[PDB]
UniProtKB/Swiss-Prot annotation, chain A:
It comes from the Bacteria. The keyword Transit peptide does not apply. The keyword rRNA-binding applies. Belongs to the bacterial ribosomal protein bL9 family. GO terms for molecular function: rRNA binding; structural constituent of ribosome. Gene3D superfamilies: Ribosomal protein L9, C-terminal domain, Ribosomal protein L9, N-terminal domain. One of its GO terms (biological process) is translation. One of its GO terms (cellular component) is ribonucleoprotein complex. It comes from Mycoplasma pneumoniae (strain ATCC 29342 / M129 / Subtype 1). This is Large ribosomal subunit protein bL9.
UniProtKB/Swiss-Prot annotation, chain B:
SUPFAM superfamilies: L28p-like (SSF143800). Belongs to the bacterial ribosomal protein bL28 family. GO terms for cellular component: ribonucleoprotein complex; ribosome. Keywords: Ribonucleoprotein, Ribosomal protein. GO terms for biological process: translation. This is Large ribosomal subunit protein bL28.
Amino acid sequence: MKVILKQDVSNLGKRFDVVDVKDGYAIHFLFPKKLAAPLTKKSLQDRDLFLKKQQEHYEINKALSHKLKEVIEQTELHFSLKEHNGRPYGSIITKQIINQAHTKGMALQKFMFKDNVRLGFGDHEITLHIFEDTTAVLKVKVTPDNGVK
Amino acid sequence: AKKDQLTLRGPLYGNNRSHSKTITRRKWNVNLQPCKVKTADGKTTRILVSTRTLRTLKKHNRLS
RNA sequence: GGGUAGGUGGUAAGAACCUCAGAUCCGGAGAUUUCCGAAUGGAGCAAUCCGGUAGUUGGAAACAGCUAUCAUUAAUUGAUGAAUAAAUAGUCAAUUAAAGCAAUACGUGGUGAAGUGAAACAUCUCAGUAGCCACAGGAAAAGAAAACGAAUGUGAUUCCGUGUGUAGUGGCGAGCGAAAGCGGAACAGGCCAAACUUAUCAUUAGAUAGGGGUUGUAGGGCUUGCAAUGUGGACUUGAAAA
RNA sequence: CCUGAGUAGCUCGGAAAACGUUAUUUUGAGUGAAUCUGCCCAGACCAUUGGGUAAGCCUAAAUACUAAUUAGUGACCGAUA
RNA sequence: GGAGAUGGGGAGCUGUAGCGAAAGCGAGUUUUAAAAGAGCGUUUGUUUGUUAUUAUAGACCCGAAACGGGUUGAGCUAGUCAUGAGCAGGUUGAAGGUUGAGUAACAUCAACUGGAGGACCGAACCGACUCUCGUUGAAACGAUAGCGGAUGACUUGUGAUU
RNA sequence: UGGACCUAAGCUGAGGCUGAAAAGCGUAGGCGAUGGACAACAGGUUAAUAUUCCUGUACUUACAGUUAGACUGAUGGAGUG
RNA sequence: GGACUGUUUAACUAAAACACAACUCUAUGCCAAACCGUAAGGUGAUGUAUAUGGGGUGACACCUGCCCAGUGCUGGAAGGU
RNA sequence: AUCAGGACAUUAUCAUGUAGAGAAUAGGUAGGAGCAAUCGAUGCAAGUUCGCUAGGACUUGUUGAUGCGAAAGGUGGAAUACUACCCUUGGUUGUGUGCUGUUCUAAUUGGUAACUGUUAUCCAGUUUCAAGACAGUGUUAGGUGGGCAGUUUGACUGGGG
RNA sequence: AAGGGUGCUUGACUGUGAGACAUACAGGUCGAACAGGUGAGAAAUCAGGUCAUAGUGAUCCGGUGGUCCAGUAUGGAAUGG
Ligand SMILES: [Mg+2]
Ligand SMILES: [Mg+2]
Ligand SMILES: [Mg+2]
Ligand SMILES: [Mg+2]
Ligand SMILES: [Mg+2]
Ligand SMILES: [Mg+2]
Ligand SMILES: [Mg+2]
Ligand SMILES: [Mg+2]
Ligand SMILES: [Mg+2]
Ligand SMILES: [Mg+2]
Ligand SMILES: [Mg+2]
Ligand SMILES: [Mg+2]
Ligand SMILES: [Mg+2]
Ligand SMILES: [Mg+2]
Ligand SMILES: [Mg+2]
Ligand SMILES: [Mg+2]
Ligand SMILES: [Mg+2]
Ligand SMILES: [Mg+2]
Ligand SMILES: [Mg+2]
Ligand SMILES: [Mg+2]
Ligand SMILES: [Mg+2]
Ligand SMILES: [Mg+2]
Ligand SMILES: [Mg+2]
Ligand SMILES: [Mg+2]
Ligand SMILES: [Mg+2]
Ligand SMILES: [Mg+2]
Ligand SMILES: [Mg+2]
Ligand SMILES: [Mg+2]
Ligand SMILES: [Mg+2]
Ligand SMILES: [Mg+2]
Ligand SMILES: [Mg+2]
Ligand SMILES: [Mg+2]
Ligand SMILES: [Mg+2]
Ligand SMILES: [Mg+2]
Ligand SMILES: [Mg+2]
Ligand SMILES: [Mg+2]
Ligand SMILES: [Mg+2]
Ligand SMILES: [Mg+2]
Ligand SMILES: [Mg+2]
Ligand SMILES: [Mg+2]
Ligand SMILES: [Mg+2]
Ligand SMILES: [Mg+2]
Ligand SMILES: [Mg+2]
Ligand SMILES: [Mg+2]
Ligand SMILES: [Mg+2]
C-alpha cells in the first residue's frame, strides 16, 4: 500500500517519495523507526497539498535532531563503573538500557531506535565508542570511560 | 473466551455436512491473533483481536 | 377516619381484668422489626463463633456496657506512586449503581438431543421441541421499504379469517408447506453522521461543546427574496374539576 | 459540495426462509467496489422499462399469559370424586 | 347484544363447461395429415342437523427390555493421600564384627558376640477352604466344629479425594 | 474435650489465566485434626452432676500500682521444636 | 500345574486364574514420549537414558530352530497416480 | 527485509538448421532484379558457441577502393542480394510468478535468567537469553483412524442352524 | 405343408382400433376394420416380424434427438413440458 517515507532508505526512495511496500515492512519496521509515514492528510491529493508543509516539517525535525546532536556533544561524561572482580573478570554488564537509563529523561533522549550501536555494547574496562544515528547523514561518537567502583 | 476484545464477535456454530449428508455439529472459531495498539503514546496493551479487526485498525492508522 | 356496647385469637369452661373521657372490631398512613438467608467485618458444619475502627459511660487499667461503621465488582473524581527520568501499571480515599428471589405463566437470544415415524435405516421426520444458560419487561419482540410485485396497483410493524392443504419443496418416500391479493382489529411517525458555520484545545485535531440536516414525484448545504407567528406531539412542572 | 467502507459484492464451508441451499437474508476464513449520467431490486444472467434509497438510532395501539386482589358464574366434583 | 338466539359483515367457498402437460379452443376438446377412429364431456345444486367410517393428534385400555437430557450419591465398597493406633506368648539363630589357628600375605576353619528374615508354632485381629444345620431364617449370607495368614505386598480409626 | 493458638492431605480463593453460557484452573490470603503447643491433684457430697459443686493444698496467663535491678531489643534472620 | 509369600468374582466358582522378583522388545534428549481436559492447568517429575511409558514372557538351570511371500513397522533415490 | 540459483513468457538485441545435384550447411511463406563502401570490403591475427574435422555465424585491431557466377551463369521439389512474417536451439542486459538454499530482525513464541507490582512458584510490565518469519492458532482440502458413535446383517423350511 | 431352392424387396411401416381371452391390481394375449404411403404379384390376395408357447425389470433420478408448449415486468437465455 502507498506510503510516503521520511528518511533515506537503501531501496525504494530518497527523502520524499511514494512507494508501494507490503504492510509487513511498513507497520512493523518503517513506521516505528520513523523511516516512513502513513497517508499524509489521508489521501493522495491531500498529500500533494500538504507536501508544501511536509518539506518544512522534515527540515525542522532535522534541525532539532542537529540540536540533539549538539546536546550529546556538549555534556557527555555519562559514566558507569561496574562491580566485578576487576583483575581477571572485566566486562560491562549494563547491556544498553542501563546506559539509556542515563540518556532519555536525564539528558538528550537518544531513543533506542536512534543509537545504532553493535550487539556487544562494549565489554572493556577503558574508553569505548558509542555510535548513534539521528538521521542518515549524522554520525554520533560518544566516549564513555569504565572501571571498578 | 475465544472472542475478540475490541468487538464481541465470537464463534459460529453450524453443521458439518459430508457425503451422505450426515449431520455433525461443529464450531467455527475466529482467527484470534495478538496485536499491540498504541494509544496516545502509551499503554501498548497486547490485545487479542481477529484479523478482520486488525485490517480495520491498519486502514484506520491504528485507531481504536 | 368509620363504627358501636361489648372485649381479653381456635381446640375453652373457669380465674383475673379492660370498656360509654368511647373499648374490641374495619379502613388509610406510620413506629418497632432478634438471628440465618443476595448476606456483604472475617470464618463457618445456616439460624453459630471470632473481631477491627471512631465515639461515649463506669474502672486504677486490662476490661465491660450503649451507639455508628467496616464485603466485592463497575463508573466518576482526587491523592499517592514501580521496574525507569517522565508516564503508566499498581495502591488508597470519597460518591453513585449492581448483586438475590419468584408467577409450576407469557418474551428475546445462545446452545441443543433422543424415544418415535418412514411399518428396517443412514438423507429426512420428530424439532429448532425437551433440557441447560443469559437478560428482562409489565408485556416482550418487530417496525417506517436499497419493500411487495405486474398494475392507469398497495404504501411501517403486529394479530385474526380466507387465499389452500394452493404454487412449490421432499431416499419426489414418510412428510413439510408459504409469499402476494382480499376482508377485519389498531394506527404515528420521529431523530442522528456528513456537508456549511461558531468557540476552544503546544489547534500538527484527525478532538470537545453549539447553530444547520434527515431525504426518493431525490433531499440537504452555497448565494438571494417572499410568506410565517401559527398547529400539533410519543412532551416538564404546577393549579382546578370530574 | 454532502448523503452512513473492511461496507455492498465475489470465492471457500454453513445456515434463514415452505424449500433438503438458491434469486432474496445472514456469517467462520480470504479478497474487495462506485458516488445521483451513482447504487440495490423485479427467482440463474444480460439489455429495455419500472420500483426503492443498504452499510445509524428510537417508536404507543391492536398481541401473549395469570401466582395475586374484588365481584360472580357453571346441563363442573361432592370424600376411591 | 345478556359469557345469548340474532342483526350487520359477500372476504370467500361449492355448483353453473368441458378437454388438454400447456399456450389454447369451446358443446366441444385431446391424439393425428384427418373432421375418420378412439379417450373425456354434451348436467343436476347448496348450507346445516344426526348417524357410520376415515385422516392428524397419546386416539379403546393396561404392559416392556430400552434411548436421550439433567441432577444426587466414595458414610458400604475399590484405589490414592494425610495423621494416629494394634499385633499375648514362645522358638530358629543369617549377614556382619572380635579373638585364635592357618596363609609369604589371601582364602579357609574354630569359639564368642550380633539379632536379620515378604522366617516357624500359636491367641487377640484379618480372611473365608470343608461337613452339618437354616432356606416363609436368629440372619436379604449366619451358627457350631474344624481351617489360612498372623512384623508384613499386614490390620485398623479419623479426615480428604477420583 | 474443642474454639479465642498453629499447620498436613485437601477445600475455598480478590486479582489473573482458560472456556459458546453455566463455569474449570489457580497466586496472595483464609479455612481445614485424625497431629503440635498450653496451668489441678486427693477426698467427700445428691435419687439423678462432678479433675466442674464442697473441703484441703496448688499452679498458669493477662492488667494496674509499687520496690529493686537492668538498655529494650521484631511483622525479619538463625537454632530448637 | 503354578517357582515361592501374596491378590481375586461382598452374597454358589480361591484355582492351574491375576500379581510377583527376573528376561526381552519398543518409544522417549526434556516445553521428552505417554495421559486427564475443549483449553488453561496438571501427572510423568521438583525425575534426565543406570530415567520414564507401553507390548509380551514369568524364580533358578539349559535352550529359543527355518520363512520378510501376505499384513504391520522403519527407511528410500528418482519415476507413475 | 536481503542475497544466490536455475525454470516458463517476453520488452531491446543477435544468431541457430548439410538426403543428392547444386562452384555451397537450401528451416518455410512473400515483395522481389539489382546490390556494397567513414552504421567502411579484398589479405591477415585472436576469441565464445557449434562441428559433418570441413564449414556457418558474431566481436575486436590494421587495411584501403575496389567488387558480387550466392542478382543476372547454372542446378534443383524448394535459389541466392535487399526489405518482412512463421518454426528447432543458445547467450544477453530486463521485468512477472512461484521452487528449493542461505543470512538479518522488528511480527510472533518460550515450562532460560533478573528486576518491579509484591512479605507472591500464578499473572502483568520491563529487560536478557534462545528461537524466528519458522513455529503455534483460525479457515479450507487430502491420508490414516472400531479410539468413539448410529445402524444393517432376508425369506421358504415336516422346529432352528 | 408351416420343409428346400430361386427372383424382387424391407410391412422387422406411420396414426389408430370395434370386439374378445385371461386376470385382485399393475401388466399380458388375439384381433376385424379405417386413413396415409409402399413391397411381391397379371390379378385375386398377402405383408403392422419369424410353425406356437421362454429370450425379460415398475417407479424415481439424470443424459440424448426432435418439437407448432411454457419462458416469473418486457425481448432473449437459463430451466422445464
Ligand atoms: Mg438427525
Ligand atoms: Mg378512633
Ligand atoms: Mg432417529
Ligand atoms: Mg422406524
Ligand atoms: Mg414400525
Ligand atoms: Mg420494544
Ligand atoms: Mg444481489
Ligand atoms: Mg430449515
Ligand atoms: Mg436514481
Ligand atoms: Mg426477471
Ligand atoms: Mg443512503
Ligand atoms: Mg381425596
Ligand atoms: Mg374412603
Ligand atoms: Mg352471524
Ligand atoms: Mg367423438
Ligand atoms: Mg336439498
Ligand atoms: Mg477407602
Ligand atoms: Mg511370617
Ligand atoms: Mg484454625
Ligand atoms: Mg486432636
Ligand atoms: Mg452417674
Ligand atoms: Mg501359587
Ligand atoms: Mg497362598
Ligand atoms: Mg463368592
Ligand atoms: Mg468359596
Ligand atoms: Mg499441555
Ligand atoms: Mg514436578
Ligand atoms: Mg503368562
Ligand atoms: Mg509357562
Ligand atoms: Mg521363534
Ligand atoms: Mg521385503
Ligand atoms: Mg512405508
Ligand atoms: Mg507453567
Ligand atoms: Mg506460520
Ligand atoms: Mg479432515
Ligand atoms: Mg470404521
Ligand atoms: Mg460399533
Ligand atoms: Mg433409531
Ligand atoms: Mg425363518
Ligand atoms: Mg430343518
Ligand atoms: Mg418335525
Ligand atoms: Mg425368399
Ligand atoms: Mg418361414
Ligand atoms: Mg435416486
Ligand atoms: Mg422473462
